[PDB]
Write an enzyme that holds these catalytic residues in place. Structure first.
Site, PDB file in Angstrom:
ATOM      1  N   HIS A  61      47.269 134.472 118.490  1.00  0.00           N
ATOM      2  CA  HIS A  61      48.537 134.880 117.981  1.00  0.00           C
ATOM      3  C   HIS A  61      48.527 135.066 116.425  1.00  0.00           C
ATOM      4  O   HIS A  61      49.343 135.854 115.972  1.00  0.00           O
ATOM      5  CB  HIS A  61      49.758 134.033 118.447  1.00  0.00           C
ATOM      6  N   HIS A  91      48.539 129.605 107.946  1.00  0.00           N
ATOM      7  CA  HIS A  91      48.503 130.837 108.711  1.00  0.00           C
ATOM      8  C   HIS A  91      49.532 131.781 108.112  1.00  0.00           C
ATOM      9  O   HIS A  91      50.306 131.387 107.246  1.00  0.00           O
ATOM     10  CB  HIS A  91      48.768 130.591 110.189  1.00  0.00           C
ATOM     11  N   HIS A  93      52.321 135.189 109.217  1.00  0.00           N
ATOM     12  CA  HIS A  93      52.988 136.098 110.143  1.00  0.00           C
ATOM     13  C   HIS A  93      53.152 137.405 109.409  1.00  0.00           C
ATOM     14  O   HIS A  93      53.451 137.419 108.226  1.00  0.00           O
ATOM     15  CB  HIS A  93      54.380 135.537 110.520  1.00  0.00           C
ATOM     16  N   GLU A 103      59.198 135.962 108.864  1.00  0.00           N
ATOM     17  CA  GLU A 103      60.045 135.241 109.846  1.00  0.00           C
ATOM     18  C   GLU A 103      61.375 134.901 109.196  1.00  0.00           C
ATOM     19  O   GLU A 103      62.425 135.330 109.697  1.00  0.00           O
ATOM     20  CB  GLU A 103      59.299 133.990 110.342  1.00  0.00           C
ATOM     21  N   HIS A 116      52.508 130.291 105.820  1.00  0.00           N
ATOM     22  CA  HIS A 116      52.946 128.973 106.226  1.00  0.00           C
ATOM     23  C   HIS A 116      51.839 127.949 106.015  1.00  0.00           C
ATOM     24  O   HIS A 116      50.800 128.031 106.681  1.00  0.00           O
ATOM     25  CB  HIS A 116      53.362 128.950 107.692  1.00  0.00           C
ATOM     26  N   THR A 195      57.834 128.091 115.352  1.00  0.00           N
ATOM     27  CA  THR A 195      58.333 129.384 115.707  1.00  0.00           C
ATOM     28  C   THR A 195      57.547 130.064 116.770  1.00  0.00           C
ATOM     29  O   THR A 195      57.795 131.236 117.084  1.00  0.00           O
ATOM     30  CB  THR A 195      58.468 130.332 114.501  1.00  0.00           C
TER      31      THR A 195
HETATM   32  O1  LIG Z   1      55.464 127.826 113.687  1.00  0.00           O
HETATM   33  C1  LIG Z   1      54.446 128.587 113.854  1.00  0.00           C
HETATM   34  O2  LIG Z   1      53.915 129.452 113.093  1.00  0.00           O
HETATM   35  C2  LIG Z   1      53.787 128.393 115.184  1.00  0.00           C
HETATM   36  C3  LIG Z   1      52.915 127.174 115.231  1.00  0.00           C
HETATM   37  C4  LIG Z   1      52.337 126.908 116.416  1.00  0.00           C
HETATM   38  C5  LIG Z   1      51.513 125.841 116.613  1.00  0.00           C
HETATM   39  C6  LIG Z   1      51.210 125.042 115.561  1.00  0.00           C
HETATM   40  C7  LIG Z   1      51.729 125.403 114.378  1.00  0.00           C
HETATM   41  N1  LIG Z   1      51.514 124.610 113.397  1.00  0.00           N
HETATM   42  O3  LIG Z   1      52.557 124.652 112.686  1.00  0.00           O
HETATM   43  O4  LIG Z   1      50.255 123.890 113.370  1.00  0.00           O
HETATM   44  C8  LIG Z   1      52.569 126.429 114.135  1.00  0.00           C
HETATM   45 NI    NI Z   2      54.315 129.900 111.126  1.00  0.00          NI
END
Ligand SMILES: O=C(O)Cc1cccc([N+](=O)[O-])c1
Ligand code: NI
Ligand code: NI
Length: 257
Positions: A61, A91, A93, A103, A116, A195
């Site tokens: 994802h 990560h 988005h 987001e 994030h 999310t």
């Molecule tokens: O909120 C998200 O981007 C999804 C998500 C999904 C699974 C773990 C995550 N994390 O914050 O380690 C984040």
């Molecule tokens: Ni996120």
């Protein structure tokens, strides 16, 4: 077998995870005029000098840059937070186009992407336990706009061809996440959720007001990733953002006037 499509996207997730229609779901639209300046807020402390990046993973994802979270090496404190939060991963988005991808929104404005940095509260001992708690996680969110290149992002962009497909990983040592932060640590904060499934309501969100600038070429490389595994039909990893959810009975607080 969830995702971001017509048939398995955000608007379906509630069938597997009823918490999708809960009281503290993320992301939200940040109405800048109605966010209230909060003088109780303690100042934000980002301590990333000792960070140890390990690996980058395409999880089907997004991609995650993972850190050694076995000691207090990269920690977030202060702000709205009580206690110490350890960096586990970051990560992004992002969109199919520059005009969408974030987001959170700011007065309904969508940015091209959103970074994030995910941290867990050390009082819970590990990530898995922390996600079961209302104050388990702190996510630092940073918007990305398209303009100048972000030099500190290039190392991430260049390794993406090695993790094109779901389940691929690569060694990713010696990456400094300080090079992804804007100048200012002014922020908005509110209580919310992860999310993606399982949508757990465990996150204190800290969204920075100042975006970072990345180049068109940098974001294009995010859009070459694939949701699919190797040897499966290609589906570009784009539009992996959940849209804004109802604010319900929450207040967004501002650290600045
Ligand atoms: O909120 C998200 O981007 C999804 C998500 C999904 C699974 C773990 C995550 N994390 O914050 O380690 C984040
Ligand atoms: Ni996120
Ligand atoms: Ni599934």
């Amino acid at each position: 077998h969830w995702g971001y499509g017509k048939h398995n996207g955000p608007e379906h997730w509630h069938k597997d995870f009823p918490i999708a229609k809960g009281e503290r779901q993320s992301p939200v639209d940040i109405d800048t005029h109605t966010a209230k300046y909060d003088p109780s807020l303690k100042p934000l402390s980002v301590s990333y000098d000792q960070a140890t990046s390990l690996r980058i993973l395409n999880n089907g994802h997004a991609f995650n840059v993972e850190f050694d979270d076995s000691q207090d090496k990269a920690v977030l404190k202060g702000g709205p937070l009580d206690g110490t939060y350890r960096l586990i991963q970051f990560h992004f988005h992002w969109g199919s186009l520059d005009g969408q991808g974030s987001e959170h929104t700011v007065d309904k404005k969508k940015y091209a992407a959103e970074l994030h940095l995910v941290h867990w509260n050390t009082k819970y001992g590990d990530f898995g336990k922390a996600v079961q708690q209302p104050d388990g996680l702190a996510v630092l969110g940073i918007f990305l706009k398209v303009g100048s290149a972000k030099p500190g992002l290039q190392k991430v962009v260049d390794v993406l061809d090695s993790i094109k497909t779901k389940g691929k990983s690569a060694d990713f040592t010696n990456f400094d996440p300080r090079g992804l932060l804007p100048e200012s640590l002014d922020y908005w904060t509110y209580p919310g959720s992860l999310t993606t499934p399982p949508l757990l309501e465990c996150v204190t969100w800290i969204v920075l007001k100042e975006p970072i600038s990345v180049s068109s070429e940098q974001v294009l490389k995010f859009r070459k990733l694939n949701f699919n595994g190797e040897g499966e039909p290609e589906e570009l990893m784009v539009d992996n953002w959940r849209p804004a959810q109802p604010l319900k009975n929450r207040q967004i607080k501002a650290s600045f006037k």
